[PDB]
Symmetry: D2
Subunit: 129 residues, 4 copies
Amino acid sequence: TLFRWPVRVYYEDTAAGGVVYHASYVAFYERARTEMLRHHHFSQQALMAERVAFVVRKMTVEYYAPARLDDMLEIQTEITSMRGTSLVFTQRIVNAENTLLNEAEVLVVCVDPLKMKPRALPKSIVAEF
Amino acid sequence: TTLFRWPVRVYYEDTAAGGVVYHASYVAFYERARTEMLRHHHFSQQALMAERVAFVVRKMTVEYYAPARLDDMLEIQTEITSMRGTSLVFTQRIVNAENTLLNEAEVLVVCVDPLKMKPRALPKSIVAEF
Amino acid sequence: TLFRWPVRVYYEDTAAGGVVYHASYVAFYERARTEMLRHHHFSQQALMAERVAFVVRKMTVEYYAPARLDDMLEIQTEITSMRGTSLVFTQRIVNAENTLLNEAEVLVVCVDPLKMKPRALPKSIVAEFK
Amino acid sequence: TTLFRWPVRVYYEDTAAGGVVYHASYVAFYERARTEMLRHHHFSQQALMAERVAFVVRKMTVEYYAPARLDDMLEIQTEITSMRGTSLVFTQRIVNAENTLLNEAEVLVVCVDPLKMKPRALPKSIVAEFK
Ligand SMILES: CCCCCCCCCC(=O)SCCNC(=O)CCNC(=O)[C@H](O)C(C)(C)COP(=O)(O)OP(=O)(O)OC[C@H]1O[C@@H](n2cnc3c(N)ncnc32)[C@H](O)[C@@H]1OP(=O)(O)O
Ligand SMILES: CCCCCCCCCC(=O)SCCNC(=O)CCNC(=O)[C@H](O)C(C)(C)COP(=O)(O)OP(=O)(O)OC[C@H]1O[C@@H](n2cnc3c(N)ncnc32)[C@H](O)[C@@H]1OP(=O)(O)O
Ligand SMILES: CCCCCCCCCC(=O)SCCNC(=O)CCNC(=O)[C@H](O)C(C)(C)COP(=O)(O)OP(=O)(O)OC[C@H]1O[C@@H](n2cnc3c(N)ncnc32)[C@H](O)[C@@H]1OP(=O)(O)O
């Protein structure tokens, strides 16, 4: 099931060319994944105290069109694959005219954050998705 | 003054090793709140740029009283406390969900022509509003 | 050939939990491409005079092991293919024990800065990196 | 007056729309220079964390006189001007390649135990380095 998250573009996100810096979109995608988890009752600050954490293992981003200061964007996010210790997020960003700006596929691994050691997905998360 | 409130969620990008918000992130938070205060009064800084009007920070003092942390929902509070000629002073504060005062700042802002970095007078539209 | 660029990890690059934030690596790779180009005298000035800019079209990043605060990293960068209007950069990050932390493949398109429309690579870029 | 100098190149990531360096990026640059001044004196904050020693910014004043721009090579200049109990004051400035003064800052830094966010005395070996 799709999760939608709005993001306003501020000065901090722009670069000298007048458009959003290509790495700023990477952060935007992370916020949307965090809010999708939050919507299903997962706080990563809370989980870290339980020695549960999620890290990016692989990421592909393809850039089609720019965003500019003051644009209101929408990040669209789905969990498309789920396995033992990892899951795949498929994401994209559109602007207020529904123009596709870019899209990403993100492989995420569940780890023990003190050992950086992969651990099985909590069955709560497997059931919730 | 007419106070303006803006909520901000703390994400991983805002945090640093050791588990508190990085000190420069607060500076960005304060800027977002000034931008949204302007938006609430019908001003767009992308729009004003084509009109050769922009705002730059000239001086800033920040007090860090207590840390924010990952997943905190914060409130930025913003007032314009002084205006004259080309510049204005914002007084801003940050509180958390307990109403703990985490941070406060005083920001001197100068209106400039962006293609030249010259100070120019605050345009009458702005000063009329605030 | 191979171009090497050192990068020190600072607090701004780290996140809560004590590792480098994943988007920080993306900026590190961009610095190394910029410095690779500079090493061949393709400074920003030189690119502007050639009426070219470079934009990232597609990028894949593999995160094998974390960098941490105070690590001195080495970014290794090579142009692995060059065709028409685009370049592919292959890049890797190792730490001071030569542990492979990260690698990336970056498709970069040559654009004119007016419409940001694709344009053929400058003959000097082609001549230098063939 | 044992000044420490640190060079910084301005990259795209540091700039904002309009073509100047974003005002918060200077704050990061000053932090890098303090960290390198500590490193030159043989201290690592990652290592100090393991000993429950950390440094946090308590107050900062920044003055923006003139902008840095893409690809400028800057020099950050840093001195410790006060050192007392749990805290130090850093005085810093940024010049560009023509020695134009772009920026000045004063930063009050407090030593804390990072697990309790509670101030503690400066490590004796750090006090010895900068006295
Ligand atoms: C971490 C501190 C806690 C706080 C979290 C901070 C949150 C902030 C968010 C970020 O910015 S994360 C920072 C950037 N990312 C990193 O630093 C991660 C660095 N990578 C690692 O440390 C290791 O790669 C990792 C611990 C994630 C995995 O180690 P391994 O090499 O032992 O993984 P392994 O080979 O055992 O396989 C793990 C899973 O990935 C799958 N996998 C690995 N490579 C794959 C691939 N290339 N394609 C498809 N699947 C792949 C693999 O099959 C398996 O799936 P399953 O067990 O569910 O079947
Ligand atoms: C820390 C983990 C590893 C290090 C990471 C370094 C990252 C890189 C550098 C940074 O980015 S630092 C992040 C930004 N700075 C901060 O988060 C510092 C936040 N400030 C504090 O936690 C305290 O002010 C500090 C421990 C430094 C000093 O506490 P004190 O009480 O000893 O000093 P002070 O007298 O100056 O405190 C002023 C006011 O803050 C109040 N306060 C202090 N800590 C508080 C607290 N934890 N919660 C609520 N209020 C607090 C304090 O009681 C007092 O209130 P009143 O004036 O009304 O009496
Ligand atoms: C095009 C940008 C559009 C907006 C995009 C940014 C929005 C996002 C928010 C930010 O991140 S703002 C970026 C950080 N802030 C700055 O870069 C502001 C830099 N400051 C200046 O360019 C000038 O100080 C300013 C135009 C604001 C005022 O110039 P003034 O000379 O009329 O005022 P002032 O007397 O306060 O300037 C103090 C000293 O700086 C000197 N100065 C100013 N501009 C200079 C310059 N360009 N080159 C060398 N010196 C300069 C000025 O002459 C004077 O030197 P002296 O008192 O020692 O004689």
